[PDB]
Each structure stands twice: as structure tokens, then as C-alpha cells.
Amino acid sequence: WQENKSWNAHFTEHKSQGVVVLWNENKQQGFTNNLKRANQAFLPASTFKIPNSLIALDLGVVKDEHQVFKWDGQTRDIATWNRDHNLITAMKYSVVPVYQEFARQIGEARMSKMLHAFDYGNEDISGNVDSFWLDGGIRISATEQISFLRKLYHNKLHVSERSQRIVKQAMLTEANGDYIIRAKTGYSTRIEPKIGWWVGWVELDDNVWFFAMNMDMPTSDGLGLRQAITKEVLKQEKIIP
Amino acid sequence: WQENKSWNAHFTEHKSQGVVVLWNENKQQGFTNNLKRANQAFLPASTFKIPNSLIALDLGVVKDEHQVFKWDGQTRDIATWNRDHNLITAMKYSVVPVYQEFARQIGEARMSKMLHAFDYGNEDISGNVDSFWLDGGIRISATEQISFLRKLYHNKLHVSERSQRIVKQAMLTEANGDYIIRAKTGYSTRIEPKIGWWVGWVELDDNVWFFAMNMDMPTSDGLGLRQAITKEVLKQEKIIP
Ligand SMILES: O=C(O)c1cccc(-c2cccnc2)c1
Numbered sequence: 147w148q149e150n151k152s153w154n155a156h157f158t159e160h161k162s163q164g165v166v167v168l169w170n171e172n173k174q175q176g177f178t179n180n181l182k183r184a185n186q187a188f189l190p191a192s193t194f195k196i197p198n199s200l201i202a203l204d205l206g207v208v209k210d211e212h213q214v215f216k217w218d219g220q221t222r223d224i225a226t227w228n229r230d231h232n233l234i235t236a237m238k239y240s241v242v243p244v245y246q247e248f249a250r251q252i253g254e255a256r257m258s259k260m261l262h263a264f265d266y267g268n269e270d271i272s273g274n275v276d277s278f279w280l281d282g283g284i285r286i287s288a289t290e291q292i293s294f295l296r297k298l299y300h301n302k303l304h305v306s307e308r309s310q311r312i313v314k315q316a317m318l319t320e321a322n323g324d325y326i327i328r329a330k331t332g333y334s335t336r337i338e339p340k341i342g343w344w345v346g347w348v349e350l351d352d353n354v355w356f357f358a359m360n361m362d363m364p365t366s367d368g369l370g371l372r373q374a375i376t377k378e379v380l381k382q383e384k385i386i387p
Numbered sequence: 388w389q390e391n392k393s394w395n396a397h398f399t400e401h402k403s404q405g406v407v408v409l410w411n412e413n414k415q416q417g418f419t420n421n422l423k424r425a426n427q428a429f430l431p432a433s434t435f436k437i438p439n440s441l442i443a444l445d446l447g448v449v450k451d452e453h454q455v456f457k458w459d460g461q462t463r464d465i466a467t468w469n470r471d472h473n474l475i476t477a478m479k480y481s482v483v484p485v486y487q488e489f490a491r492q493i494g495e496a497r498m499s500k501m502l503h504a505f506d507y508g509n510e511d512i513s514g515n516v517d518s519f520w521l522d523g524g525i526r527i528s529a530t531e532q533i534s535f536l537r538k539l540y541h542n543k544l545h546v547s548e549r550s551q552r553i554v555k556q557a558m559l560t561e562a563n564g565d566y567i568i569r570a571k572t573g574y575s576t577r578i579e580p581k582i583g584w585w586v587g588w589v590e591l592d593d594n595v596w597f598f599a600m601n602m603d604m605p606t607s608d609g610l611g612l613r614q615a616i617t618k619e620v621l622k623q624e625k626i627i628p
């Protein structure tokens with residue numbers, strides 16, 4: 147590991163504070179602006195939709211990425227949630243209610259065994275089965291996010307290869323002639339400190355860089371900074387043009 | 388099918404000639420600027436790397452999307468061909484020599500066998516086993532490209548689901564918050580008429596539009612028009628912003 151305190155400027159300039167963690171797969175070397183915060187554990191919030199998808203697919207709770215989960219007819223504050231969804235759109239729009247039903251069908255016992263099986267975070271599902279990743283006892287750090295994402299990339303998680311391919315398809319966020327990003331955002335508000343996540347990796351012709359960032363998020367006005375700050379660290383380190 | 392000659396303006400502006408074919412999956416309706424050229428069968432050229440990849444993967448010639456295929460040391464006119472590749476990069480750069488090695492190991496019989504199962508074009512592989520899609524007898528029209536792609540999208544081709552998922556990953560071309568494009572380019576130069584291809588689909592939240600276009604290509608200077616003209620039609624039809 148190598149600490150690069152010059153990156154703190156990227157958070158300072160937007161009157162913010164947070165951590166970005168990078169991992170060079172080819173060289174097996176990591177980088178962060180803050181070794182301390184890189185190992186501090188936060189609620190995963192909607193970043194939990196990755197393992198939640200893996201478990202639901204492997205158990206048959208979700209048949210495939212085409213299965214439609216109909217809106218329950220309850221009007222919610224986020225308009226894009228008030229409609230039918232499949233796996234791709236449910237993760238694109240971070241549709242909490244869809245994944246809360248997943249959790250209720252997966253059940254306490256199978257969820258716990260799988261998270262220990264994944265070595266995910268502190269592997270503690272204490273709380274309510276349908277919201278513990280939002281206000282329960284589960285916690286995970288940025289460096290731990292990267293360890294989990296690296297296994298997903300290599301199809302090393304203890305679920306089928308098919309489940310890992312579908313979830314990685316669902317994680318597709320951005321793609322052009324220069325790079326491919328697969329990631330998931332997160333926004334934790336029910337427990338202090340309020341933070342936003344962005345975890346995933348960038349695929350190049352001859353390498354993959356894994357990343358995991360979290361930052362203070364006192365208001366929803368700053369959510370766009372999750373991607374904005376991350377990409378700047380990538381540009382600075384010459385990972386993306 | 389419905390003919391929309393107003394699209395011809397997009398070809399005329401760039402002193403070009405060609406066809407674009409679109410298919411609305413939800414509504415099971417097709418649209419094109421030239422019904423006749425839409426059903427005209429040409430050499431597939433590098434669009435053939437879709438079926439070829441499916442065959443190589445299903446037969447074990449290709450293990451997975453990470454397997455490395457060494458450069459043979461022959462300096463060729465296209466710089467990106469003079470290096471090592473995997474399935475992802477081999478298609479991104481239309482690396483002919485990599486896929487000719489696939490064909491040689493697939494063999495004449497198994498290739499003919501598979502294309503019949505795919506109902507691909509005229510199913511005629513006459514010529515060299517490793518160049519028939521470049522200067523052999525195989526022929527396929529734009530409408531037939533879409534019919535074949537529709538089976539791939541729905542995992543209905545007679546190869547494993549795994550093979551079809553991998554090829555759909557390797558077809559990834561562009562992705563943003565508004566759409567995803569999985570497609571493949573083509574460039575037929577060895578036999579007249581010289582044309583360029585672009586075939587695939589654009590994934591939206593609530594629908595999928597399949598597309599297949601070809602145009603006259605007397606010189607390599609106009610290759611970039613394949614994507615440009617297609618997108619102008621997509622913008623006009625309000626499919627992409
Ligand atoms: O960005 C996210 O991951 C996410 C997930 C759930 C809810 C929200 C959210 C909640 C309230 C306002 N704006 C966004 C964001």
C-alpha cells in the first residue's frame with residue numbers, strides 16, 4: 147500500500163472529505179489518500195445491492211435479468227421507483243423496495259450464511275431482514291469493498307458463474323472506446339455519519355483498476371461528487387483520458 | 388415492415404448510399420429506408436465475428452474472455468493487430484488473424500454444421516475455412532442479421548447460455564445513463580461491392596431496438612460514417628437523446 151495525500155485536494159476543493167482507494171490488478175498494488183478512513187467501516191447502503199443480487203439469483207429468488215418485479219402501487223418519494231422494474235433497472239435506479247422484497251424472500255438464515263460465505267464486511271445482519279443494510283449492524287470498509295469486488299471479477303465467489311456474470315452485467319455503468327466501468331452507488335442516511343459510496347472497477351485493454359470511495363454527504367445536493375471526484379483521481383493517475 | 392424514405396437524407400448529406408434497418412421488440416415492428424436493400428444479401432465480413440465467437444466458445448476453442456492469443460510475429464498493416472489479444476480486444480479491433488485461427492481449429496464441417504443450426508444467412512461456407520466470410524460464398528441481409536441477433540439477445544441460439552452471455556459481453560460498444568449499445572462493425576473489401584456493416588441493438592429501460600445497417604464503402608476514409616449515420620436515424624426516431 148502507498149498513501150498519496152495530494153489527492154485530498156480533490157475532496158478539499160469541493161469543501162468535502164472522504165476517501166478513494168485504488169487497486170492495480172496487474173501490479174497488485176494499492177493507493178489511497180487516507181489509510182485510516184480506507185479501513186473504517188460504514189453502512190454499505192445501496193452498495194449492498196451487489197451481494198443482495200448475487201444471493202437472490204443463486205437461490206432462484208430472481209430467475210434472470212428479464213424477470214419483471216411489478217410496482218406494489220404504493221407511491222414513494224422517488225418517482226422512478228413507482229413503476230415496474232427488472233434487475234438491470236432496479237440496480238440502475240437503486241430501487242430499495244424491490245431489494246427489500248428480495249431480502250424477505252431470502253430470509254435471515256440464508257442471508258447470514260451467504261455473507262459469511264462471501265467474507266463480506268463484518269458479516270453481521272443484525273437488525274430487520276428488510277433494512278439491516280440501511281439501519282442495521284452491518285458495516286464494511288473501502289478496502290473490504292475492493293476485496294469483495296476483486297473476487298466477483300474473477301468469478302471466485304461461492305455462487306454460480308452465471309450469477310456473477312448477470313450481476314456484473316447489471317453493474318454496467320459506463321462504456322466507450324477507452325474504458326468500461328461497472329459499479330454501484332450508495333447513499334447512507336439513517337445512521338451517522340451520512341455518506342455516499344461509489345464502488346466498482348474500470349476495465350482497460352491490458353489491466354483493471356478496482357476502486358472504492360466514500361465521502362461525507364450531509365445533503366443529497368452533493369451526490370454527483372461521488373462519480374466526479376473518483377474520475378478525477380482516475381484522470382490524475384492516467385488511468386482514463 | 389414500414390418504409391421511411393426520409394432517412395435517405397442522412398445518407399445523401401455525406402454523399403453516401405446504404406440502408407438502415409430497425410426493429411422495435413416490444414411492438415414487433417420493423418422500419419427501414421429501403422425495403423429492397425434491407426433484404427439484399429452481402430458478405431458479412433467482420434460482423435461474422437459474432438457467430439464465429441459463439442462457435443469457438445461453445446466448442447472449447449476459446450476457454451473464456453480472458454484467454455490470451457499470442458501475436459504470431461507477422462507485421463500487418465493494422466498496428467493494433469500486431470500484439471496479443473483476448474476475445475474482448477480481438478473483437479474491439481476486428482483482429483482478423485485471431486479469428487482465422489479459430490476457424491481453422493473449428494474446421495470446415497463443424498462450421499457448416501453450426502451455421503445451419505443458427506439459420507445464418509445462406510448457410511454457405513464455400514471457400515477457405517479461414518476466409519469464407521471475407522471472400523467466400525456466405526451471404527446475409529440486414530433483415531437476416533436482425534433475426535439472428537434477436538435469437539442471441541433472448542439466448543435462443545443452439546449453443547450454451549454461457550457462450551451467448553460471453554459474446555454479448557464482448558459485443559459491448561457504448562453505455563451511458565440513457566442507453567447501452569451492443570454491436571459489431573464490418574468492412575468488406577476483397578470482393579465487390581465494397582461495403583461497411585454495423586449491426587446490433589440499443590438497450591433502453593423499457594424496450595430494445597435492434598438495428599442492422601450497411602453502406603457502400605469505396606475507400607476506408609468513410610468508415611466512421613457507419614456509426615454516425617445510424618445514430619442520426621436513432622436520434623430522429625427519439626430512440627437515443
Ligand atoms: O444513489 C443511491 O445509491 C441512492 C439509493 C437510494 C436512495 C437515494 C436517494 C434518496 C433520496 C434522494 N436522492 C437519492 C440514492
Ligand SMILES: O=C(O)c1cccc(-c2cccnc2)c1
Pocket residue numbers: 433465481572573574607610
Ligand atoms: O471497421 C471494421 O469493421 C474493420 C474490420 C476489419 C478491417 C478493417 C480495416 C481494413 C482496412 C483498413 N482499415 C481498417 C476494418
Ligand SMILES: [Cl-]
Pocket residue numbers: 314315318555556559
Ligand atoms: Cl456487459
